[PDB]
Amino acid sequence: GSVSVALHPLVILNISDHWIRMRSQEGRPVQVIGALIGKQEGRNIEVMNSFELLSHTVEEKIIIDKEYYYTKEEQFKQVFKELEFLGWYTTGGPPDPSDIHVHKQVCEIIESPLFLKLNPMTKHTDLPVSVFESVIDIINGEATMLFAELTYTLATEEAERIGVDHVARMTATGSGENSTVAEHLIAQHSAIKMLHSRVKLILEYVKASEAGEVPFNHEILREAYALCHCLPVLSTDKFKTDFYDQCNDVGLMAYLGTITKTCNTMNQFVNKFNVLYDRQ
Amino acid sequence: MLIKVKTLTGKEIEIDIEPTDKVERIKERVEEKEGIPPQQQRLIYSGKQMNDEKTAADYKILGGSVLHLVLALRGG
Amino acid sequence: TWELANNMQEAQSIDEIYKYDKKQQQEILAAKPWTKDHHYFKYCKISALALLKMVMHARSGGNLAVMGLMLGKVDGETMIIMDSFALPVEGTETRVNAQAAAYEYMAAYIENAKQVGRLENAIGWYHSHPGYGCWLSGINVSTQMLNQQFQEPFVAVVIDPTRTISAGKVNLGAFRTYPKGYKPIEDFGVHCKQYYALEVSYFKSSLDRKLLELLWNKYWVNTLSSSSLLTNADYTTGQVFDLSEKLEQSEAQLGDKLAKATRDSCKTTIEAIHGLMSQVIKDKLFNQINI
C-alpha cells in the first residue's frame, strides 16, 4: 500500500518551535510553511530533519519560491550527505484548496511529494499530525490533487527515548506555578484511561459474543478467561510486608524534610522577630 | 572609503580604505581599531573569503555589502 | 474539566522567555554588567530542540569527533540557548580543525536564518569528546581564552557521545572560564584552576510540553509498570548525602544557604512521595480486584 512512512520525534519539535516563535513575534498566530527531508529506500520513506522554506504571498495566495530552496539545498548537503527532498509541512486543520494550490508547485519541484499536517488547535486523543500522499486524478477538467491518508510510525534511534525522558522529567514545573501534583497525577491518568478503554473494548466484544452479534470464536474467549483469572496479582504476605516497609520508609523520609522546612520557617520568624519587638 | 564591518556578535567597525590598498594593510588597520591579532582574522566579502595575496583593486561599492570578520575557533 | 486548566491560547512565563526584547538586549549589552566582576553568570538554560540536535550530530559523527555552533541570548544573570546548528568539519577522533568550509558555513547559515526570521546571534560552540569524559583540553582552554576575551558573551559546551549512549544519561557540560590573572579533582583535568563548571537547566514551551506529553503517552505499560524509587535508589542516596553536606555548611554559616538546602530537601521529599503515590495507585488499581 503506497509507501511506509517513518516519522521521527524531531520534525514535530521543529514545527512547534517555529509556531511558538512566530506566535510570540507577531502576537497573532499565523500559518507557517516548511519542508521535510529524509531517505527513500524502495517502498519505504523515512523523515530525518526539516528546515523552513521561505514563502511569498501574492494578493491572497501563497507561493513557494524556487531560488531560495535551490540555494539552501546545496548548503545542508555538506553536513547531511544521503538526505533528499520528500515534502513539506504546514499548520492548519482540514485540507483547504489553498493546500492544493501550494502543493501544485511542490509537485512541480518533486514528482510525488509527501504532506504533513500539524494542528495546534486539536481537541482529540489522536496524533495532531497526518501524512498525505499526492494522487493525480484522471477525470477530465480541473484535475485536483487528491490526498491519500497513510499510516505514520514512531521509528526512533537509540537516543530518542532517553532525551525525551530527560526533558520531560522537569518541564519547568516549579517555575510556572503549575503544581507538581497537576503534572504527576495527570501524566499517568491518561495511561490509566487508555487501559480502561482497552478493557472496555474487550468487555464489549465478550458481551457481543455472548449475545450473538459476532460468531462464536472459541479461541479468544479462552484468552479472556485466562486474563480474567490473573487479576489478583501477588496477594502473598511477603509482598504486603515489603509494601508496608516501603510505605514506612517513605514516611520517615518525608518526616525528615518536613522537619527542616518547619525549621527554616522557624529561623525566618526569629530573624524577623529580632528586629521588630527587640532592638538589635 | 567608508566601509562597514559587522561581526556575528554585534560589533560594528567603520573603516577608511584607499581603493588600491593591500589586504595586509586593511587587516593592520582593523587590528589597530579593534585589537585583532595580526594573523588570525578570517574576512568574508559577499559570502566569499578574501584572499590574502589578492590585494584589493576595485571597490565598486558605496555601503551595503559588508565584510564580516570571524576568529579562528578550533578544538581538540 | 478533567484537566481543569487545559489550554486554548493562555500561557505563562514559561512561554514568555521565547521573545526578543530589542531595547532590553541593547541596554544590557551597553551596560555590560558581567565585565565588572569575574563571578557572573552561573545559570545556563538550553532548550530541548538544541539538545536533541546536538545529540543526533554527535551520534552521526560516530567514533570520530564533530563540532558545531549554538544560538541564543543572555538575560540578566542567566544565559538562554535555544538553537543548535551543526558544521561540516572532519578529522581524527582526537583532533578537529575548522577549515574554510566551516568559515563559509556559519556566515551562510546565519544569513539564511536571518532571511527566515531568526533574530538570535552566536552564543557559543559544542564539541564532542568520544570517550574521554567532559573536560576542556589545552587547545580548548586557549580557544576559550581568546573567545571569551574578544567576544565577552560566550560559553563552551562539551558532551561525551559514547558514555551518554552506554550509560543512558546525557553528558551535557556547559563551561565558562576565568580570565587570565585571577588565580583563586583529577577528572576535570590539569587546568582545573583556569576553567570552571556551570549548572545546566532546560525549558520547553506550552505547545512543546503538550506535544511531548501526548507523544510520550504511548508508553503506558512502562508508565504504570516502572515502579520508580527502586531504580533511582543510588541517585536518592547521593542526593541525601549532598543534603547532609549542605546542611552542615549552612549550620557552619549560621555560626542564604539555608534556603537552598530547604529547596533541595523539598525536591527530594516531593520525588519520594511521588514514587510512593504511584506505588499506592498501582496497588489500588491492580491488587484490589477479584478479591
Q: Residues of B with CB below 8 A from C122's CB?
A: 8-9
Pick from C270, C236, C247: nearest CA to A264: C247
Burial label for C75, CB within 10 Å (0-12, 13-18, 19+), is: middle
B33 phi and psi, to 5 degrees? -70, -45
CB–CB of C115/C81 below 8 Å? no
A248 interface with C at CB cutoff 8 Å:
no
A58 phi and psi, to 5 degrees? -125, 125
Pick from C267, C68, C31: nearest CA to C157: C68
When scoring A78, A161, A164, A240 by the number of chain C Cβ atoms within 10 A, the one with the most, hence best to mutate, is A78
CA-based R_g, chain C, Å: 22
Whichever domain contains B26, its CATH number is 3.10.20.90
**Residue B66, domain member (yes or no):** yes
A78 interface with C at CB cutoff 8 Å:
yes
**Residue B39, domain member (yes or no):** yes
Helix axes C257-286, A237-276, angle to 10 degrees: 150
The grid coordinates of residue C16 equal: 514568555
- Residue A15, beta-bridge partner list: none
Number of domains in chain B: 1
Pick from A92, A86, A99, A88: nearest CA to A118: A92
CB–CB of C119/C158 below 8 Å? no
Q: Residues of C with CB below 8 A from A176's CB?
A: 12-14
Rounded Cα–Cα distance for residues C133 and C163 (Å) = 8
Instruction: Calculate how close chain C gets to B20, using CA atoms only, in Å.
Output: 26
CB–CB of C134/C171 below 8 Å? yes
Query: How many CB atoms are located within 10 Å of the residue A98 CB?
Result: 14
Which of C100, C108, C150 shows the shortest C-beta gap to B71? Answer: C150
| E strand or H helix that includes residue A255 | helix A237-276
CA-based R_g, chain B, Å: 12
> In Å, how far are A156, B75, C14, C43, C69 from C127, measured between CA atoms?
24, 8, 29, 20, 9
Helix extents (H) in A110-236: 159-170, 180-211, 220-228
C166 interface with A at CB cutoff 8 Å:
no
Burial label for A201, CB within 10 Å (0-12, 13-18, 19+), is: exposed
Q: What angle do CA A101, A103, A105 make, to 5 degrees?
A: 85
CB–CB of C66/C89 below 8 Å? yes
Pick from C142, C82, C164: nearest CA to C118: C82
Pick from C194, C204, C193, C46: nearest CA to C124: C46
A227 interface with C at CB cutoff 8 Å:
no
Residue A2 gets the label, from left (phi > 0), alpha (psi -120 to 50) or beta, of left
**Residue B76, domain member (yes or no):** no
The grid coordinates of residue A39 equal: 531517505
**Residue B8, domain member (yes or no):** yes
Which of C103, C139, C150 shows the shortest C-beta gap to B42? Answer: C103
Residue listed under C-alpha cell 488499581: C285
Q: Which residues of C touch B (CB under 8 A)?
A: 29, 67, 94-98, 100, 103-104, 106-108, 110-111, 121-122, 125, 127, 137, 139-140, 143, 146-147, 150-151, 153
In which domain, by residue range, is B63 found? 2-70
Rounded Cα–Cα distance for residues C253 and A98 (Å) = 67
Helix-, strand-, coil-residue percentages of chain C, each rounded to 5:
45, 15, 35
Those residues with Cβ within 8 angstroms of residue B51's Cβ, 6 or more apart along the chain or in another chain: B23
Q: Sort strands C67-75 and C78-86 into parallel, antiparallel or unpaired.
A: antiparallel
**Residue B10, domain member (yes or no):** yes
Pick from C166, C285, C159, C279: nearest CA to C231: C279
**Residue B54, domain member (yes or no):** yes
Burial label for C217, CB within 10 Å (0-12, 13-18, 19+), is: middle
Q: Sort strands A114-118 and C78-86 into parallel, antiparallel or unpaired.
A: unpaired
**Residue B6, domain member (yes or no):** yes
**Residue B75, domain member (yes or no):** no
Rounded Cα–Cα distance for residues A4 and A154 (Å) = 11
Instruction: Calculate how close chain A gets to C237, using CA atoms only, in Å.
Output: 11
By CA distance, what is C277's nearest residue in A?
A185
